[PDB]
Amino acid sequence: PNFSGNWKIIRSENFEELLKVLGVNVMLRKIAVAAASKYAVEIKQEGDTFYIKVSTTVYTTEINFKVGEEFEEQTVDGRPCKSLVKWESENKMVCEQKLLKGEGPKTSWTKELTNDGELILTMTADDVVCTQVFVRE
Ligand SMILES: *C/C=C(C)/C=C/C=C(C)/C=C/C1=C(C)CCCC1(C)C
């Protein structure tokens, strides 16, 4: 299917609560929520190979992976991790992550393309789920 696109955020729920679990202190959580409104995701998908570029005003990061193949990235709060993406259905994928060093909350993310043309990202840390919704630019 067509995950490829230039996606811009329209809605972000529970992001602050996610950062709290991750041990980010309050003033930085607030500054981060503010930065999440100027926030875009660029995806290029060919088959089950994905290129994903996440950008805010002052920072940009690139993610490259093949579904079913372990790769290295970072958790939301910046800790390196080993990741593995699998399909859950036609238009939804799930990524499980394991810390490279040390211990912390169990994190993961999902991406889904809806019937109505939205991209839904969820990010989880333990019991807390952050949901973000994007539309094409
Ligand atoms: C597949 C799409 C993914 C894995 C998106 C990941 C997005 C992030 C790790 C976003 C992180 C952000 C912060 C850590 C604070 C500044 C605002 C965000 C939302 C860009």
Q: Distance between CA atoms of 28 and 121, rounded to whole angstroms?
A: 22
What experiment produced this structure?
X-ray
Which of 24, 95, 109, when mutated, tests ligand 1's pocket best, judged by the most ligand atoms within 8 Å of its CB?
Answer: 109
Distance 58 CA to ligand 1 centre (A): 13
**C-alpha atoms less than 13 angstroms from C-alpha of 64 in its C-beta half-sphere:** 0
Q: Distance between CA atoms of 47 and 1, rounded to whole angstroms?
A: 8
Tell whether ligand 1 has an atom less than 6 A from the beta carbon of residue 39: yes
Distance 15 CA to ligand 1 centre (A): 10
Residue nearest to ligand 1 atom 19, measured at CA: 36
Distance 122 CA to ligand 1 centre (A): 10
Please state whether 28 falls in left (phi above 0), alpha (psi between -120 and 50) or beta: alpha
Give, in order, the Cα–Cα distances in Å from 10 to each of 13, 34, 39, 43, 136.
10, 13, 9, 17, 10
Tell whether ligand 1 has an atom less than 6 A from the beta carbon of residue 32: yes
Residue nearest to ligand 1 atom 10, measured at CA: 76
CA 47, 86, 108, 114 torsion-angle sign: positive
Resolution in A: 2.1
Whether residue 72 contacts residue 81, with contact meaning beta carbons closer than 8 Å, is answered with: yes
CATH superfamily, domain 1-137, is Calycin beta-barrel core domain (2.40.128.20)
